[PDB]
Design a protein around this ligand. Structure first.
Ligand SMILES: OC[C@H]1O[C@@H](O[C@@H]2[C@@H](O)[C@H](O)[C@@H](CO)O[C@H]2O)[C@H](O)[C@@H](O)[C@@H]1O
Ligand SMILES: OC[C@H]1O[C@@H](O[C@@H]2[C@@H](O)[C@H](O)[C@@H](CO)O[C@H]2O)[C@H](O)[C@@H](O)[C@@H]1O
Ligand code: NA
Length: 441
C-alpha cells in the first residue's frame, strides 16, 4: 500500500529568483523581484535574491544533492530576465546557453528536467508598461516561451507555462505583498486575465515552435477550503474563498469560463472576458501541476477585504513555522480534481513545509516534523492513487532553503539546509527519509 508506479516522477522543486543569485551577470536584466526586494520594508528580513543560494554558479552542487537524494527529476524555472532582458526585445544567447548546459548536466545525471517558464520574475521594463495589467505582456510572454522551447525543446519534454497565477495576480497586484506590490482589486483581476491569456497564447506558440511533441501544463496553488461551521454565512465565505483562489483559475482553464458567482461578486472590477480570450485560455493541457501547502478553514469576515473570509485556526491541528498541517487536504483536493474537473494527468509540483531548522551538535538537521509532513502527505497520495487519481509524480518543496519571497531567507523550506553565508548545503533528515522511501520503490 506503499508503492508508487515504477515510472513515477520523484523530484524536488525550486524557482530561479529564489536560488540563482548572479542577478546582473551574463546579460541578465532587472526583474520586478529585483525592484521589489531592493525596496525598503518589502522583505521581512532585509534580504534580496542578489546572491540567494548562488545556484547560477552552483547548480552542479544542486545536481549532486538531487543525485544523493535518489531523485529522478528536477523542477526548476528559467528566468525570463536572462533570456529576454528587456521583456520585449532581443534575446540574450548567454542566458539560453546557461540553461542548455544545465539541462545537459541534468540529463547526464539521469534527472528529467521539468521546466517552468514563469515563476514570478517579470522583466521590470514590462512592468513599467503596466506588466500583467497589459495584454501586450501576454503576447510577449508567448514569444519568450517560443524562444526557449526552440532551444531546449529537443531535450525537455515537460514544460509548465506559469507557476501560481493567483500569487502573481492577487499577491502582486491586489494585496501588494509580492512584486510588483500594487494594491487594487481591479488590477489584480486584470492581471489574472492577462496571465491566463499569456498561458493560452504560450501553449499554442510552444506547440508551433516545438521540435518534438511536448507535455505542456500549468501549475496552480490550490487551497481546499472548509466552512468552520455549517451556518450559511460561513459556508458562503468558504465558497467565496474557494472561488478567489481555486475556481477563478480552474474553471476558465477547464473551458467553463470564469465562475459566475465570483463574476457577480467582483462586479465591474472583473475583466471583460470576451469569448475569443476564453477559447485561448482553455487550450487542452497535457498535465496539471498542483502546489499544496495548507487548507483554509473559513469564517465569514464581512468587514475584511474581498473575499470576506478569515482563517479560523483549529486547535486539533499542529502548525509548522508558518502554517497549519492538514495532510488530508491534499487527498480532498486531488479527489476534487479527479471527479469535478477534466485535467489529467496530475503532478504534485510543490509540497513541503517550513521549520525553525538548525544544525545540530552532530551536524545533521533533525527535522522530524518535516519527515512526518512528507510521510503523511505521501500517504494521502497513496489513498488518492487508490481512488483512481491519475497522479504521475511528486516534487518536494524545496530542494534547498532559499529566498522565500516576502519572508526572505528567514523561512526555511528545504529538504537540504543552505548556509547563506558560506553557501554550503547539507541534507536534512527529511531528505534522507525521502531518499530511502524512493529507493524502496
Ligand atoms: O479529456 C481529458 C483532457 O481534458 C482537457 O480539458 C478540456 C479543455 O481543454 C476544453 O476547453 C474543454 C472544452 O469543453 O474540455 C475539457 O475536457 C484537459 O485540459 C486535459 O488535461 C485532459 O487530459
Ligand atoms: O514562500 C512559501 C510558499 O508560499 C506558497 O504560497 C501559499 C499558497 O500555496 C496558498 O495557496 C495560499 C493560500 O492558502 O497561501 C500562500 O502562502 C506558494 O505557493 C509557494 O510557491 C511558496 O514557496
Ligand atoms: Na509547531
Amino acid at each position: 500500500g506503499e508503492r508508487f508506479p515504477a515510472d513515477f516522477v520523484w523530484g524536488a522543486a525550486t524557482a530561479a529568483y529564489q536560488i540563482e543569485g548572479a542577478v546582473r551577470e551574463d546579460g541578465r536584466g532587472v526583474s520586478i523581484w529585483d525592484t521589489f526586494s531592493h525596496t525598503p520594508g518589502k522583505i521581512a528580513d532585509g534580504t534580496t535574491g542578489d546572491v540567494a543560494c548562488d545556484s547560477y554558479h552552483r547548480y552542479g552542487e544542486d545536481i549532486g544533492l538531487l543525485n544523493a537524494l535518489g531523485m529522478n527529476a528536477y523542477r526548476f524555472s528559467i528566468a525570463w530576465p536572462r533570456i529576454v532582458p528587456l521583456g520585449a526585445g532581443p534575446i540574450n544567447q548567454a542566458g539560453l546557453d546557461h540553461y542548455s548546459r544545465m539541462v545537459d548536466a541534468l540529463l547526464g545525471a539521469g534527472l528529467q528536467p521539468f521546466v517552468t517558464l514563469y515563476h514570478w520574475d517579470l522583466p521590470q521594463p514590462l512592468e513599467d508598461r503596466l506588466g500583467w495589467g497589459s495584454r501586450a505582456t501576454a503576447t510577449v510572454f508567448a514569444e519568450y516561451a517560443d524562444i526557449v522551447v526552440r532551444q531546449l525543446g529537443d531535450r525537455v519534454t515537460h514544460w509548465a507555462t506559469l507557476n501560481e497565477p493567483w500569487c502573481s495576480a492577487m499577491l502582486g497586484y491586489y494585496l501588494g505583498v509580492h512584486a510588483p506590490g500594487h494594491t487594487d482589486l481591479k488590477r489584480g483581476l486584470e492581471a489574472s486575465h492577462n496571465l491566463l491569456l499569456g498561458h493560452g497564447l504560450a501553449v499554442q506558440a510552444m506547440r508551433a515552435a516545438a521540435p518534438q511533441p511536448l507535455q505542456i501544463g500549468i501549475v496552480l496553488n490550490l487551497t481546499p477550503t472548509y466552512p468552520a461551521s455549517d451556518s450559511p454565512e460561513d459556508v458562503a465565505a468558504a465558497r467565496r474563498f474557494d472561488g478567489f483562489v481555486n475556481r477563478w483559475f480552474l474553471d476558465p482553464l477547464a473551458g467553463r469560463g470564469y465562475p459566475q458567482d465570483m463574476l457577480d461578486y467582483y462586479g465591474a472590477a472583473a475583466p471583460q472576458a470576451n469569448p475569443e480570450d476564453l477559447t485561448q485560455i482553455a487550450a487542452p493541457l497535457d498535465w496539471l501541476g498542483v502546489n499544496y501547502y495548507e487548507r483554509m478553514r473559513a469564517v465569514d469576515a464581512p468587514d475584511a477585504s474581498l473575499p470576506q473570509a478569515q482563517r479560523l485556526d483549529d486547535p486539533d491541528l499542529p502548525h509548522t513555522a508558518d502554517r497549519e498541517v492538514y495532510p488530508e487536504g491534499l487527498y480532498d483536493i486531488l479527489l476534487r480534481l479527479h471527479n469535478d474537473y477534466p485535467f489529467r494527468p496530475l503532478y504534485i509540483t510543490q509540497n513541503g513545509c517550513a521549520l525553525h531548522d538548525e544544525i545540530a551538535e552532530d551536524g545533521g538537521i533533525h527535522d522530524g516534523q518535516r519527515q512526518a509532513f512528507f510521510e503523511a502527505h505521501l500517504a494521502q497520495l497513496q489513498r488518492a492513487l487508490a481512488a483512481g487519481v491519475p497522479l504521475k509524480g511528486y516534487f518536494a518543496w524545496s530542494l534547498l532553503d532559499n529566498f522565500e519571497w516576502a519572508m526572505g531567507l528567514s523561512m526555511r523550506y528545504g529538504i537540504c539546509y543552505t548556509n547563506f553565508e558560506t553557501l554550503e548545503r547539507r541534507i536534512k533528515d527529511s531528505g534522507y527519509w525521502l531518499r530511502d522511501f524512493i529507493a524502496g520503490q
